[PDB]
Design a protein around this ligand. Sequence first.
Ligand SMILES: [Zn+2]
Ligand SMILES: [Zn+2]
Ligand SMILES: [Zn+2]
Ligand SMILES: [Zn+2]
Ligand SMILES: [Zn+2]
Ligand SMILES: [Zn+2]
Ligand SMILES: [Zn+2]
Ligand SMILES: [Zn+2]
Lengths: 347, 347, 347, 347
Amino acid sequence: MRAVRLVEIGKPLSLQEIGVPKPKGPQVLIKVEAAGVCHSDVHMRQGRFGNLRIVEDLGVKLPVTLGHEIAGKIEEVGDEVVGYSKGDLVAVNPWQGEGNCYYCRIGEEHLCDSPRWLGINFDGAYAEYVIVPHYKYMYKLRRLNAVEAAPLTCSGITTYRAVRKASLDPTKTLLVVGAGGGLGTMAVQIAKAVSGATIIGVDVREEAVEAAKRAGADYVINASMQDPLAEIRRITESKGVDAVIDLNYSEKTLSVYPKALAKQGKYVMVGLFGADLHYHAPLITLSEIQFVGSLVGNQSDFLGIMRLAEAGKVKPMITKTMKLEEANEAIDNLENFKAIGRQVLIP
Amino acid sequence: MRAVRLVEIGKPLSLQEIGVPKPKGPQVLIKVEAAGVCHSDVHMRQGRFGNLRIVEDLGVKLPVTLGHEIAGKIEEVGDEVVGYSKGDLVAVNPWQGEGNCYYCRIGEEHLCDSPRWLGINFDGAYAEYVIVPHYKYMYKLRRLNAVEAAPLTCSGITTYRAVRKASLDPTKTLLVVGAGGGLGTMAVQIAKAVSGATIIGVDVREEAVEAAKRAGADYVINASMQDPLAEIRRITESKGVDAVIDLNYSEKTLSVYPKALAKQGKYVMVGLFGADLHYHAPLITLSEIQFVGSLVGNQSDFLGIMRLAEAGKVKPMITKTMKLEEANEAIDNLENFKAIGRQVLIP
Amino acid sequence: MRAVRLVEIGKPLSLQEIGVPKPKGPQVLIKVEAAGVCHSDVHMRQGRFGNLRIVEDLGVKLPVTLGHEIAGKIEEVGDEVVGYSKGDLVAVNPWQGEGNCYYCRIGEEHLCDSPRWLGINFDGAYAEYVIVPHYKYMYKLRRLNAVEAAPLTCSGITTYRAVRKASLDPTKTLLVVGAGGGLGTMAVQIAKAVSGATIIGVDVREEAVEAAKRAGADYVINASMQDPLAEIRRITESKGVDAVIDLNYSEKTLSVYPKALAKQGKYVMVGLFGADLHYHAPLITLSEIQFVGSLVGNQSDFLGIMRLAEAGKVKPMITKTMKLEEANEAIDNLENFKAIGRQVLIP
Amino acid sequence: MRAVRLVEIGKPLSLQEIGVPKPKGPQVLIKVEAAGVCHSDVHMRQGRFGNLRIVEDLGVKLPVTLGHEIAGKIEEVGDEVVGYSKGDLVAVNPWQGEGNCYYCRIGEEHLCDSPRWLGINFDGAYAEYVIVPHYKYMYKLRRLNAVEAAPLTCSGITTYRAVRKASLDPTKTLLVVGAGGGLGTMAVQIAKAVSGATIIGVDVREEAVEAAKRAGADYVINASMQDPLAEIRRITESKGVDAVIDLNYSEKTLSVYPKALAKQGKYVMVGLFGADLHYHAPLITLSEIQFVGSLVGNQSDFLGIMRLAEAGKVKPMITKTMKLEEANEAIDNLENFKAIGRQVLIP
Ligand SMILES: [Zn+2]
Ligand SMILES: [Zn+2]
Ligand SMILES: [Zn+2]
Ligand SMILES: [Zn+2]
Ligand SMILES: [Zn+2]
Ligand SMILES: [Zn+2]
Ligand SMILES: [Zn+2]
Ligand SMILES: [Zn+2]
């Protein structure tokens, strides 16, 4: 089968012709119908994941097939597989744990001590087929097609968990920063579907502000036009917001938005940008605010976003389909921030 | 009555002879049998509270009587007081809310938008009598005397809430920083009394290390003689700790102890020291750590620490009793870090 | 002023001409614009409340003006009232506590040991004016008029708390029993506005099933046509539901719907009907199900329902307006189950 | 190897000579050094487990080796086992899941839809060797030996979870019913080690009342000699208890102790006795009480109890060692309630 792989850091991905693994035991062989490409793969093609080394830290033994956003049809099931048959359309949770460590035992497998992340330190979906280590990481699609689902396994689970960490309820207000981008609109949609909280989206372009409104925000702010802190204060009648979700935070967002926090406000940071949080400690204790990080999500988060998306309660990302051969191209566009829409590789 | 009051910023407290207020409605006049003095009174005699101005921010109309650590016998009760009688020995929760704002409605009264903090922006216990705005803020002492209880209304409630925010259970490990000082040993005792978590105490002098161990720590570390991070790494088998309670944090502690956090770990900061939190953002997202602030506590936290103490499950702070007149003196020793043990004024 | 009061048990309410109280301190005098009437008032005109005696248990000193569903305009404010002004239209939370008991301290005021329930053991809104003990129990109306808001102070808060007790999230499914009734549709609307859970509504007539569908149920079951437990199994792929909300339970609902629960499922029961819960203990332990009671709610619950309603996120109850003098008739209609919609008296 | 097995329902267990399975993949073959025996095995020797049929319900293809309380040294590890070596002394969590169902995904593996319960529907520890389906279900013993640890896999995890379900804190009071039996003293110790709550222990013979007191109960009551309800109301000053943990409830306990519940009290039921819960529904709603079932526990509960025990924070159950050959004998003893102390078979 054809597979686009990381054979050497720095160097572009390489198309190879490798053997189609044979599924044994709980394993499932999936014929890939969609392989999402995201910013992570930009930093992945450079041998890193945030600031770790896939080789030194995650134990990657190059070459490795990339692609951690996976949906497709079951081609074959191992002999121990239960509850799935050839022909089933599924999405796959790639953030897999080994089972024995503390995080696996308490059901937070994505924080596993020795992670098995598909497409990061194990072969992924940039190929005609992909082995899923255990059938329990799958979700049968009934309403969504593969292209619609694949991005949910990464951006969907990430934003779903970030919304959960914002601890929202009907008495609260949420601020979503960068609310008109891919991640932002998804966070707005999920917060709207799952919380009852008032949702405020802030962005910096008229088009992105409109996308935030279309995604369901109750209020939107164009920070290039209005002082955002003053508009947040006006909307919340000087209370501030009870949570901020800052997806792909930057040095700028971290310096501005914590000031919009109400007492006990939670500032949820998502992403891997090389920026530092700088905050006056007394301001933290006096207001009991919290700064909390989030990345990807666990099996319950996967269940949650998949259930929302399958019920149509949240919508698929704006998508651009491309062929496998275009993998490097797709990633280049993400480097030059020339990727308008989630790129998904299709057969 | 006699009353030591902050009549002018900078200038030392003044011993005045003002009248004894008359208790009306749900108010309660307490004859002070113990007024604690703590570090906050040092930064108080300087017209501030962390970085605010009791006058401009907390609306303090000087002169204002200090003393937010209160315990005494009821002298007289308003006509709407129920369940308390003249003579009753009580401790008082000074962190009072007005009831109408968001924070009062959800039961977080200490975070009230228009706080009524006894001894901070309302007349405190640095006097012979003190008015408690509402009887519900009192707790009937049965086992403890005024001197032992008075510190609990500040240090006890503060550390009780900090332990709750650590979100501890038996599967977890807590690090208490400064574990051998006044606040540190209380935190250790409370954590040992209420969570079942493994408790590590760290301090910098052999004497403080012994006090932490005597307060119940499972493991104690002397950071002057050992590398706390290496010790913690082995105690937790490289996982790190699930919470750090940093009472009276500094630029130094904030720069060291966050590195001890396990994934999902909570760094609970308590106090008003002029230090800034500096932390690389990707470290926060990758490990899902949380920096959480905490100060004083609500009516539930007061009930909790008083119940523990009355049942002897947590012991009174080490105290040195003095006279009302020695107020300015008491606050001096705190300024010059010459005060060993909680100073308690006895009118 | 005119006031319809319970001057004797059994005997029908009595229209009296009493004096308009004077508001002092934190008290607020409201000019009633809407006094909701509900089933509770049936069991109230009979000196009871579930199984208690308002006189013996709640300390009711007859005569007492009924009316616990209250909205109107501020006529006058006590001298200590802050944040409200004459002419403000407000809804009132009647489930008030005294503040000192355990439940009040932990923020569960409706479960107070010495409750101050307006319209129950204190003068309520079946009159031209009503005294609210403390202004903090009010909520300013902007979107809603008094008639729309009054029922929310009872059915709204009750149902909102029931939904919170069901512990819903996007990975779960809820069953609302009697989903087409006034309380049932409110529960469906709230669950849809606040949770992300999949919602199944069940009722027993075609028109009721339609009402549940309009309220927002994802699935509906006509139990007069299909076996409801089998249909719930089909919908949930044999898992059962993670919660049941059974508002105004009967002997019939309690004998059938707990069987629909998934493992760990919560059966939230609301109401005072004289029925017994009857269930085989081993089934409870084997499935870890929970039976949980709920009645009315606290300040946070009131905040939540008013915020949803004021934002239009949940709709007001179908209402029939009547005159104060018709109070007895209104209650009669509830006894003869000839009441269509929530009856609201307008003085 | 020697293996006592349930070859036919009704008929007593049969000592057989079966081969020692070979551990493949993630499996681990353990050399049993302790096989606890508890009441469940009595109810098991009768093909049942509460009321089910291990064959019909749990898919038990007889003969099946009993023994769900497992501890011993690792004889051999599969080729996929990490973190454990031949020679390691371990305790085993028998309440295992398959991974794919909702309950496994959310980390509640004991509630798995297709449970793999060692000693119940999978071969247990009544043998010289036993296969563990996956190494993650193990815990390395450091301070405990096999005999001390094996019972924890059942009574320890069960009571640990019951205590968590009681939702305790320092402001609360817990009643443990059957407080002086093996399960009861474990529950008391755990509540004392992990909750801060005041503990009332009730039992029905003086020797058991004394054992409850030695286990940590603050108050103890002999329900044989004194009205337990009057005594509880005296101790709690009429508030009632905030939780009851009813270990091996009976028709008697369930008809009595719910009456001792405070408002919001949680009644935690543990066990499989043939009794019905009968309770007036209005009492449930008026007081917001909860009846909640609890059975065994999940991976996090197992981690918690093993941590407590390995730290000496709770003590091993009183045990009586016997030989594999006496399996039927031990179960007989439990049938005739002639068994004093947890019987542990040592092949
Ligand atoms: Zn991705
Ligand atoms: Zn792991
Ligand atoms: Zn203090
Ligand atoms: Zn307030
Ligand atoms: Zn009502
Ligand atoms: Zn109360
Ligand atoms: Zn057992
Ligand atoms: Zn399962």
